[PDB]
Amino acid sequence: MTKDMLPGSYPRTPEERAAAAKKYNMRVEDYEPYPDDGMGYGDYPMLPNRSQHERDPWYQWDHSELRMNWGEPIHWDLDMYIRNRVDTSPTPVSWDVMCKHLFGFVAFMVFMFWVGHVFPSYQPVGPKQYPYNNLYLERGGDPTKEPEPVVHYD
Amino acid sequence: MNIFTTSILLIFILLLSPILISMSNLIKHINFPLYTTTSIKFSFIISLLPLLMFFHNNMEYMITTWHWVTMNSMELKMSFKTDFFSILFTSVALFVTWSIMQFSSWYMHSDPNINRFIKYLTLFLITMLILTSANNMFQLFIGWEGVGIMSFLLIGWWYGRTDANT
Amino acid sequence: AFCAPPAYLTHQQKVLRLYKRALRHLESWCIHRDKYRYFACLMRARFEEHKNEKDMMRATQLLREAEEEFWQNQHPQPYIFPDSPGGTSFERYECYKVPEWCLDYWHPSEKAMYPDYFSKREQWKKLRMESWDREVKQLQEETSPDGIMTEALPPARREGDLPPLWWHIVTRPRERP
Amino acid sequence: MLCLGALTTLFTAICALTQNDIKKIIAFSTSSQLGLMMVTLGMNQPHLAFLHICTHAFFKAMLFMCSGSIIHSLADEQDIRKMGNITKIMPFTSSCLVIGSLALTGMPFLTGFYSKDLIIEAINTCNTNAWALLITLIATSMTAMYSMRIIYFVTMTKPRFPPLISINENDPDLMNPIKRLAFGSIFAGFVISYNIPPTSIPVLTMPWFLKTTALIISVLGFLIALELNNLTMKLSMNKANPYSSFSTLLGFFPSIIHRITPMKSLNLSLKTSLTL
Amino acid sequence: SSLFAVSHVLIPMWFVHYYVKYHMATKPYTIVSSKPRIFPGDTILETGEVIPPMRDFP
Amino acid sequence: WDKDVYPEPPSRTPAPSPQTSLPNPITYLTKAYDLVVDWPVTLVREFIERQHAKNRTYYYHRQYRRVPDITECKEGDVLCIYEAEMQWRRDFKVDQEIMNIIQERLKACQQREGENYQQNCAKELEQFTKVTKAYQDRYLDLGAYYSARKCLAKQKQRMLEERKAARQE
Amino acid sequence: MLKIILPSLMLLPLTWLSSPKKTWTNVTSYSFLISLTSLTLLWQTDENYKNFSNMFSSDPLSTPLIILTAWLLPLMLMASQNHLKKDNNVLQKLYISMLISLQILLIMTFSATELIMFYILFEATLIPTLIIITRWGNQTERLNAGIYFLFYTLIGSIPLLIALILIQNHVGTLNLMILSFTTHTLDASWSNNLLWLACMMAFLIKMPLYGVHLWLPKAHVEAPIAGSMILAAILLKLGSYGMIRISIILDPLTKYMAYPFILLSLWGMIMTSSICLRQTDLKSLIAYSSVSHMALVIASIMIQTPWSFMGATMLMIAHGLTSSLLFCLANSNYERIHSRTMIMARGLQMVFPLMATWWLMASLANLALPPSINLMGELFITMSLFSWSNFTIILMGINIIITGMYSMYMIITTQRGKLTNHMINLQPSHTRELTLMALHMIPLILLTTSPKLITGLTM
Amino acid sequence: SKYKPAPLATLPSTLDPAEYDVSPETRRAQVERLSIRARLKREYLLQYNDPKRVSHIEDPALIRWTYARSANIYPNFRPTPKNSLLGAVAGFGPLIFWYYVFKTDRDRKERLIQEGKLDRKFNISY
Amino acid sequence: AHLTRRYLWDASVEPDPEKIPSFPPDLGFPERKERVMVATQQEMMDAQLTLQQRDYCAHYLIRLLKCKRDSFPNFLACKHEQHDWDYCEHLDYVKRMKEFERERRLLQRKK
Amino acid sequence: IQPRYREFPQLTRSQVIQGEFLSSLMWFWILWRFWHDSDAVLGHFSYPDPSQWTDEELGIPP
Amino acid sequence: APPLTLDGIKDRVLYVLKLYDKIDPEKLSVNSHFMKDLGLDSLDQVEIIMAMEDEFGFEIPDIDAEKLMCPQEIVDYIADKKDVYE
């Protein structure tokens, strides 16, 4: 390969835009570089932030399991927007209401667990009675010390 | 006693015999899934004996089959906690695995590399019986991570599709 | 999969694809056959109405409204055939679709285990090598001079010729090897 | 442990509702019963959780193997909307599957009782948290519901499968394993519970509406699911809801988290880490 | 058909019993089990010591 | 093996005392297991034992004699310091093995007492805690570069603290 | 030791005086025999370490590095045999001579008693590496890579010479046994903190730290292979060894001059593994993984506890083996596609179903698989760090997660998927490059079967 | 209407105001697009199924991508505000945060030690 | 249903499950007979019982375990033994409910 | 064995007999172990009504 | 679960086509067009392809369904896809 076939810097002229789009195999009215905030982006095109799920699954692409062709400029983020990693496909339900419903359900669950902690459900019964001073000796008693004769009643 | 420990160890040995013969040149000339199925069956039949012994006497043995390494007052060693839970889970898992092995010999034909599937099932069962019988926690983590990878490999059985891998 | 799409993609097949996916999502909702049949007839009535408008600025808005009211009733879990995208068994056997060129690296101990196959294969490859140059020439001498072109792949006109760019269509691995 | 297990037992149960794939339904059944077992660990009754382990094994194995028979019999198709009338075209698989579903529910003498009865008895005889009790009971009802959903859409309605019938239930590498698991799912809980040593002391002095609450609520879930799955047979255009998609989709938890969390992770991993 | 048994069950049991008996039960604390759970009213094999019964319930 | 280092209470077992007029599959399987597995195995081990006794060989323990400790050692004399550091490292390894022995005792006691362990496994517990505190006052807050001099500095700081304490009436 | 490094010198005439057709074979076999005779110094029946002369010694930290250095040479030599096969015979033999020089100098480093011996040899190692990277690299960035890799080291190492010279003028000997038994506590002044930095920020460059690591990707990505093997396997460990040796004369300054470096190592480990999650170049992915691993060794040596030094040794050896293995596995595909881009070829395990097992095992070594000397090291240094501060596990766990992720992603997007049907040049396999992976993995299994050896000074 | 797109969960082809334009100025755009697509497709095929093609295909777009993401970064890096401040933050902020975390923990620990209090009843191996 | 009575209406006079022996034992009791044990400590220990398990009703558990050991085949042998253990435990639970209701009726004595 | 298009296929006695046997064995087991042990309806013991109890039993003064 | 042949495919396709009731059982042939030879619409063609899909248990994509306008074209498509002849 060589220089004219590889990327470069922001074109900043119409003829450079045209040469860059002809390099990247694009339509000049579709070419759109990055906005020159000052970063590694030079003449490399901005493409739509759309995943590889949204590409036609039935078309026999040249790069199957990637949904691309031998040319077809690669998005800067073709290491995250692949089928295996991230999906920006639409949903029948919208992002806003989905997040609202999920967070509300979780928060209501938390609130009701707190309400259950403060309104427990105890069987109307006392505590169990254990005979030998709550088994003082069978739970590390230190037999030399004298115990605390706590006693239950019939 | 000898019978208890002998049976416990013999289970793992039977389960390792298929993985031994898989690395040999004898996967041909026999029917490897039937051999594995029979190994699981005999392992279950052997595992019943510790179960009956426990139901009788309720002893909850502890074995330290092999010493691995000392680390400044820390003796890493292979050791098994052969209590209620271990035996009752071992027997059940071997029962279900025998049945699943017959099924996976019926299902999973149309697959040339069915023996790899069978070997992976045996390896999962071995990691599970390590996890289930462990007395240490390094051994338990061996079985833990083993289960994890086995699920990675069996979920991703059909490695062509980009949903099984996800 | 076999035929490549156009650019314009006129109104009619948009409407028809809408009809198809709508009937399918209805089948998903209306699980039982009687119900799906009833509501499919009702949907065909809905489409038959407004079939003849002659107003390409009314039919398009009817399309947009119908697509919107489809999206507001899109089944979340529709039916998907296996061996189709988004479904089970889609790329399942792709792990078992080995190409043809892998036989070029076989040893003469496996090839000896299948001699007649390779006897036919060598003459297949000979056919390919013979037809390649004429095939390239045919594609060269049929270029649209205005510039625009498609993935249409013209056929062979003469005898002794082969339809251009066929070795990847022919020789494609079977779907259940 | 109590609150988390109860949350799971509710969530995966209501999510199994309005699922079409059998395998996912059994997965959410596993998650629900597992949440119930974690609920059991939420109190000092782990041995009962282990009994539920040993009994759940047989149910799930049998259910998945009946499902796999149903699947490999016909093509790779796994969705109840194209399964049809399996009581008649596969009597063996249907019989075993119904046994497994009934035992998954708290049917009184099929190895699901010998844990689940004690489970619900313990949980309505303990002083921990009322919302956990309530949603676990609702989840048991939902267990009855989705079991009835499988039994309806797979085993009772008319055929929806394609017309080329190539079923073969006859293979000894198929019938014998589910037969063994069925003898398991009928006998092993009795055997185990009457052979194990006694631990995790049970409470049994309590009113009648707590000793029969699991049976009642499972029966009532069966009734509701029967009625509601009969409601689809008649002609009326049913609509989507804000409900029925929180179940069809999984509360949108995958559809959100699996595409924001890796998004921010990977974006921060390229920029702010490598190229910055 | 018991050649499978004698070549997959007996030989490993022989080796394993050899190990358990002459490399594990020799070393001190390899095999450790709980107490055998005596009950009132049994004679003990080791000493003949009879555990007495429980005082009579009402 | 040595039941004074590794003590084991006697395995008192109750007599069977059966009630059923029915069989136990454990015992007959034990008879079969014995007369199948234990008899040829015992034959093989007796063969191996007599073949050992044909040509018996012995080995020893290498008693290491004590040496001038580092407190009797001059600042700079690298030979004395080397010998003292060596005998210290020897004692250090021995102390780790002692700690391992006591931990082993504790675990075995916990298993044999099993459920009722926190009342009759306190002897080994205290025998573990005491030696633990010794190790802690002896080797703990050092690092990878432990040495006789560092242990000595630690001991000296601790004796200084104790002197300052007992200064108080 | 002399019996190990004289035969290693005799391997050079063995190259130059042999036939062109019987030179790889003889030198490979005799290198395996050097590796064999490098096991006599594992005969340590005692606590006292093995001094053979004023020059040479061997402790349990030296010996694993010695053996691994002697063992890598046949592997480098066979991996280097497909490329430069069409090279002239003198060029081959020059490659062989450079590799053997690396062997000799590195053995001399790990066996050295004084620090100046170690210095001149630690720096002599630069010349073979630079020659290998530059004359036999395939690309044009190899020159800038060599410049980076040389001058980072020299910048760090000149202060090291100054500090060693100071220590000689202050004590008199600079020998490691005597600096052990005669080490005065330091007065805790700036004049000694600069000494700490001068002694440490030569090794910390070479390990490397995250503040300074740009030499390691540029070199791994551009060295042919064998340079990459060495640069991943023992040149990074040549800094850890030095830290473990020199830290003894810097107490108590390590209690507070270590916070920045522990912290840099931890955060930059997370940063590097996140980079590994998203990286077009496979040979760079391995390199950033090496940074994310050696950072733990940095933090561990800074903590200076027994568990920590131990786990550092374990991780050192394990990482060396598995990283060399992964570089071999990537080179196996690079010798066919001639591209380091990973997403190019992504549907293997059809053609290479056995190499795809070596891939899997190499990755499971990389991530924390428990029955492995990788997880033993990672776990023990995690335990040391938790003792140090309980709030470090929050970072180690993020690392564990990302380290499962990038390794499994590597495996998937390289092996699993649909075969790139447009690659007729995927030749079946080489018995040579299968034996390579076997010889990398069989040691891992053996050392896992007996890690009593692979520990260090403290166990 | 009743669908709110986002950066994720994008707007489909079915509901965009475009995809229904029947203007004459969008059509020639789409046609030049298809022409480029088909040109490069016929190139990739004429290289794919050429016998005597023994090697693979080089795929220059992937190479341009790797170069843009590896080596074309620093030449086009220009320091600016929102670059310098962002780098200073993302470099030295987590550093300082974890510094104060660990410092507080260690200080509290040595305090509670030297006071002669800390519960280390069995810490042996450290 | 004895939870409405404190969470909804008539609160602060129904007992808490904790502090159930709030008032002294002998209030209203002119004489008292302390509860007895029949299973001594050595029997109850050597039978290898669990701490939760060795309550006042442990002797019937010992009998059940003696059955389940001696007549091990025919594990269905002694159900009467388990019935006795369950009956004694039911009576213990009834004593527990009795203490609850005692305290409930006594918090109403205040007002 | 053969396939059949759009029609109901001939069923083997094996599978139907085995299904009937498993199902009937399940129902036999339920009837048997429910007739014997009907302790799921209610237990041997009654939940006593506490409100109707005395206070002499509880020992309460006015 | 046996395979399928070109004659079987033809028979099944005509079986499906002999029950639409807009195509009478006669008037059809294996080459018979739908629009010109039988007076069918486009939506009817879509319904026909749906019938083929839920007959054979797989999907015909829309781009290819737009082309299928004779039953022999359907048979050719299913024959090329499922790899029938051998």
DSSP annotation string for B93-115: HHHHHHHHHHHHHHTTTT-TTHH
CA dist G416 to B149, D85, D212, G409, G425, Å?
15, 39, 53, 10, 19
Cis omega before residue G252 (within 30°)? yes
CB of B111 closer than 8 Å to CB of G350: no
Residue I70 and residue F20: Cβ atoms within 8 Å? yes
d(CA D253, CA A105): 11
d(CA A99, CA A106): 11
d(CA D275, CA D270): 6
d(CA E12, CA E16): 6
Query: What are J12's strand-pairing partners?
Result: none
Kindly list the residues from chain I whose CB atom is less than 8 angstroms away from the CB atom of residue D203: 93
Q: What is the DSSP letter of E50?
A: B
Whose CA is closest to B58, among B87, B97, B18?
B87
At B79, give phi and psi (nearest 5°). -155, 140
CA dist A86 to D257, G253, G377, G429, H6, Å?
10, 48, 34, 34, 15
Residues making up chain A, counted from first to last: 154
Kindly list the residues from chain J whose CB atom is less than 8 angstroms away from the CB atom of residue D186: 25-26, 29
CA dist H94 to D67, G384, I83, Å?
52, 22, 66
Q: List chains touching K (3+ CB pairs under 8 A).
A: C, D, J
- Structurally, chain G folds into a number of domains equal to 1
Quickly count: other Cβ atoms within 10 Å of residue J38's Cβ.
11
Whose CA is closest to A65, among G410, G358, G414, C165?
G414
At I48, give phi and psi (nearest 5°). 60, 50
d(CA C18, CA C22): 6
d(CA A7, CA D52): 63
Catalytic option among K7, K11, K37, K41: K41
Residue H39 and residue C132: Cβ atoms within 8 Å? no
d(CA D22, CA D28): 10
Taking CA–CA distances from G415, the nearest residue in chain B reads B159
Relative to beta strand D164-165, strand J4-5 is: antiparallel
Tokens representing residue G229 in the block: 């093997």
CA dist F93 to F138, F141, G177, G377, J9, Å?
13, 17, 20, 22, 79
d(CA F30, CA F38): 10
Q: Confirm whether K41 is a catalytic residue.
A: yes
Q: Which residues contact G443 (CB under 8 A, 6 or more apart)?
A: G71, G321
Whose CA is closest to H83, among G268, A41, A39?
A39
Give the domain extent around G299.
2-459
CB of A1 closer than 8 Å to CB of H60: yes
Whose CA is closest to G289, among G239, G220, G223?
G220
Residues making up chain C, counted from first to last: 177
d(CA G394, CA G400): 10
Quickly count: other Cβ atoms within 10 Å of residue G251's Cβ.
16
**Signed CA dihedral, G89, G95, G97, G99: sign only:** negative
Residue carrying structure tokens 């427990």 = A120
Tokens representing residue B17 in the block: 């015999």
Q: List chains touching G (3+ CB pairs under 8 A).
A: A, B, C, D, F, H
**Signed CA dihedral, G373, G376, G379, G382: sign only:** negative
Tokens representing residue D82 in the block: 């194209």
CA distance D58 to chain I (A): 23
CA dist G392 to C87, F144, G243, Å?
43, 20, 22
CA dist I99 to D205, F19, I11, Å?
15, 41, 19
Q: Which residues contact F102 (CB under 8 A, 6 or more apart)?
A: F124, F127, F128, F131
d(CA A4, CA A20): 9
Kindly list the residues from chain B whose CB atom is less than 8 angstroms away from the CB atom of residue D50: 84-85, 88-89
Element spanning D226, H or E: helix D213-230
Alpha helices in C9-166 (DSSP H): 11-29, 33-48, 59-71, 115-140
Q: Which residues contact F15 (CB under 8 A, 6 or more apart)?
A: E42, E43, E44, E45
Interface of F with H in 126-145 (CB under 8 A): 129, 132, 135-136, 140-141
Alpha helices in G174-305 (DSSP H): 176-181, 190-200, 203-206, 215-220, 226-233, 237-246, 259-276, 282-303
CB of A67 closer than 8 Å to CB of A83: yes
Query: What are G58's strand-pairing partners?
Result: G50
Taking CA–CA distances from A153, the nearest residue in chain I reads I34
d(CA B143, CA B150): 10
Alpha helices in H15-118 (DSSP H): 24-48, 60-70, 84-114
Quickly count: other Cβ atoms within 10 Å of residue G37's Cβ.
12
Cα-only R_g, chain F: 26
d(CA H85, CA H89): 6
CB of D73 closer than 8 Å to CB of D160: no
CA dist A43 to A3, A40, G69, G351, Å?
13, 10, 47, 39
Kindly list the residues from chain D whose CB atom is less than 8 angstroms away from the CB atom of residue A34: none
Amino acid present at B98: W
Kindly list the residues from chain F whose CB atom is less than 8 angstroms away from the CB atom of residue G457: 144
d(CA C1, CA K20): 28
Q: What is the DSSP letter of H8?
A: S
Residue H83 and residue A6: Cβ atoms within 8 Å? no
**Signed CA dihedral, G298, G299, G305, G308: sign only:** negative
Kindly list the residues from chain I whose CB atom is less than 8 angstroms away from the CB atom of residue J55: 28, 105
Whose CA is closest to A108, among D7, D139, D2, D134?
D7
DSSP E strand stretches across chain A: none
d(CA G208, CA I73): 68
d(CA D255, CA A87): 9
At B75, give phi and psi (nearest 5°). -95, 90
**Signed CA dihedral, G93, G98, G99, G104: sign only:** positive
Element spanning F123, H or E: helix F122-139
Q: What is the DSSP letter of K33?
A: -
Tokens representing residue K66 in the block: 């737009």
Amino acid present at G236: L
Amino acid present at G99: L
Whose CA is closest to D52, among D9, D3, D4?
D9
Which of D63-80 are b and which e, b meaning 16 or more Cβ less than 10 Å from the residue's Cβ?
bbbbbbbbbbbbbebbbb
Tokens representing residue C24 in the block: 């399918």
d(CA E22, CA E12): 15
Helix/strand/coil for J48:
coil
The distance from CA J60 to its chain's CA centroid, rounded to whole angstroms, is 45
d(CA H14, CA C63): 10
CB of G310 closer than 8 Å to CB of G455: yes
d(CA F141, CA K81): 74
Residue I72 and residue F24: Cβ atoms within 8 Å? yes
Query: What are B67's strand-pairing partners?
Result: B77
- In a 13 Å sphere around the CA of J43, the CA atoms on its Cβ side amount to 21
Q: What is the DSSP letter of G71?
A: H
Alpha helices in G2-114 (DSSP H): 2-16, 24-37, 62-79, 89-110
User: Phi-psi region for residue C147, left (φ > 0), alpha (ψ -120 to 50) or beta?
Assistant: left
Size of interface A-G (CB pairs under 8 A): 15
C47 CB near a chain K CB, below 8 Å? yes
Q: List chains touching J (3+ CB pairs under 8 A).
A: D, I, K
Query: What are G112's strand-pairing partners?
Result: G56
Give the domain extent around K77.
1-86
CB of G147 closer than 8 Å to CB of G37: no
Tokens representing residue C37 in the block: 């049949």
d(CA F82, CA F3): 38
d(CA H59, CA I87): 83
I58 CB near a chain D CB, below 8 Å? no
B160 CB near a chain C CB, below 8 Å? yes
Residues making up chain D, counted from first to last: 276
Element spanning A79, H or E: none
Residue G275 and residue D268: Cβ atoms within 8 Å? no
F129 CB near a chain B CB, below 8 Å? no
Quickly count: other Cβ atoms within 10 Å of residue A52's Cβ.
24
Tokens representing residue C17 in the block: 């694809």
Residue carrying structure tokens 């066929």 = C166
Amino acid present at G425: N
Whose CA is closest to B161, among G138, D153, C84?
C84
Three state DSSP letters for D36-101:
HHHHHHCCCCHHHHHHHHHHHHHHHHHHHHHHHHHHHHCCCCCCHHHCCCHHHHCHHHHHHHHHHH
Amino acid present at C77: Q
Kindly list the residues from chain G whose CB atom is less than 8 angstroms away from the CB atom of residue C91: 418
d(CA A25, CA K7): 48
Cα-only R_g, chain H: 30
d(CA I69, CA I75): 9
CB of F19 closer than 8 Å to CB of I71: yes
Rounded (5°) CA angle D259-D260-D264? 120
Amino acid present at F119: Q
Taking CA–CA distances from C77, the nearest residue in chain A reads A92
H44 CB near a chain A CB, below 8 Å? yes
CB of F96 closer than 8 Å to CB of B72: yes
Tokens representing residue C135 in the block: 């095939």
Kindly list the residues from chain A whose CB atom is less than 8 angstroms away from the CB atom of residue G343: 66, 78-79
d(CA D130, CA D140): 15
Sequence-separated contacts (24+) of H29-36 with Cβ below 8 Å: H29/A27, H29/A29, H29/A30, H30/C7, H30/C8, H31/C7, H31/C8, H31/C148, H32/A27, H32/C148, H33/A27, H33/A30, H33/C7, H34/C6, H34/C7, H34/C148, H34/C150, H35/C147, H35/C148, H35/C149, H36/A25, H36/A26, H36/A27, H36/A71
Which residue from I17, I93, I94 is facing D127, i.e. has the nearest CB? I17
Cα-only R_g, chain I: 19
Cis omega before residue G208 (within 30°)? yes
Residue C20 and residue K62: Cβ atoms within 8 Å? yes
CB of F119 closer than 8 Å to CB of A138: yes
d(CA D143, CA D13): 7
The experimental resolution of this structure, in angstroms, equals 3.0
Taking CA–CA distances from G304, the nearest residue in chain H reads H126
H94 CB near a chain D CB, below 8 Å? no
Which of E44-57 are b and which e, b meaning 16 or more Cβ less than 10 Å from the residue's Cβ?
eeeeeeebeebeee
Helix/strand/coil for E7:
helix
G451 CB near a chain B CB, below 8 Å? yes
d(CA C3, CA G326): 43
Q: What is the DSSP letter of H21?
A: -
Question: What is the number of H-type helices and E-type strands within chain B?
Answer: 5, 2
- Structurally, chain K folds into a number of domains equal to 1
Element spanning B65, H or E: strand B61-70
CA dist C96 to B77, B85, D62, G418, J28, Å?
43, 42, 30, 10, 49
Kindly list the residues from chain F whose CB atom is less than 8 angstroms away from the CB atom of residue B2: 33, 38
Element spanning B133, H or E: helix B114-133
CA distance H62 to chain A (A): 7
Which residue from D127, D199, D203 is facing I93, i.e. has the nearest CB? D203
Whose CA is closest to J42, among D243, D121, G222?
D121
Residue C102 and residue G421: Cβ atoms within 8 Å? no
Which experimental approach was used here?
cryo-EM
Taking CA–CA distances from J4, the nearest residue in chain K reads K1
Q: Which residues contact D50 (CB under 8 A, 6 or more apart)?
A: B84, B85, B88, B89
